[PDB]
Amino acid sequence: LRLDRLRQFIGELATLLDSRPDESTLLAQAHPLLAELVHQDDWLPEDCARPDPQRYQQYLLHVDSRQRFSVVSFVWGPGQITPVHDHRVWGLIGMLRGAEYSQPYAFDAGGRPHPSGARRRLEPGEVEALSPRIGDVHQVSNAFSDRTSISIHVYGANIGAVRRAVFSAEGEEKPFISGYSNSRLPNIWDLSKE
Numbered sequence: 001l002r003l004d005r006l007r008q009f010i011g012e013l014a015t016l017l018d019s020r021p022d023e024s025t026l027l028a029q030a031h032p033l034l035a036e037l038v039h040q041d042d043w044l045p046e047d048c049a050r051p052d053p054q055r056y057q058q059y060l061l062h063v064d065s066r067q068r069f070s071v072v073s074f075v076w077g078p079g080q081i082t083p084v085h086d087h088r089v090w091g092l093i094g095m096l097r098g099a100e101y102s103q104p105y106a107f108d109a110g111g112r113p114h115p116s117g118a119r120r121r122l123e124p125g126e127v128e129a130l131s132p133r134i135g136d137v138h139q140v141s142n143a144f145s146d147r148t149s150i151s152i153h154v155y156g157a158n159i160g161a162v163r164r165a166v167f168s169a170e171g172e173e174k175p176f177i178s179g180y181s182n183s184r185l186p187n188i189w190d191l192s193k194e
């Protein structure tokens, strides 16, 4: 495993964040950092790539000391899908293997959510951005019904601890905390094992 590439990404993102950019500058300059990471699929620990039959898995890879960001391996078993939901922090999503569909939503005056633009297909190597400022609400699904798809997510917080919400088609808001699938993180720092 090329865990040095993951270490490099974490270091460089933290370096960008050290210059205290606004969200727009951050998303713009971190976009190529993550695309470079997901351009080649040779680093993700198999532990953090494992699908589950009932639900997709969320494997935490790294959290910044000051929680300025977290890096999560998002794993879709065949045909799995999220409900419509928000994030409340900035996010960058890089596709690793397989593919996923992403449909942005927006609310009318009465609460009800509607698709607010074209559904997007994210191919391996591609990166998309989200945040409360530029659009925070979407529904995501595995683009395939016959395979496992994986995307790497970077959020502007410890996303598993962020209190957010899911929305029904009728617009019912329900409190949501995603948590994480792994009770143990991969050790990506023991260089003497490389």
Ligand SMILES: [Fe+2]
Pocket: 085, 086, 087, 138, 140
């Ligand atoms: Fe999401």
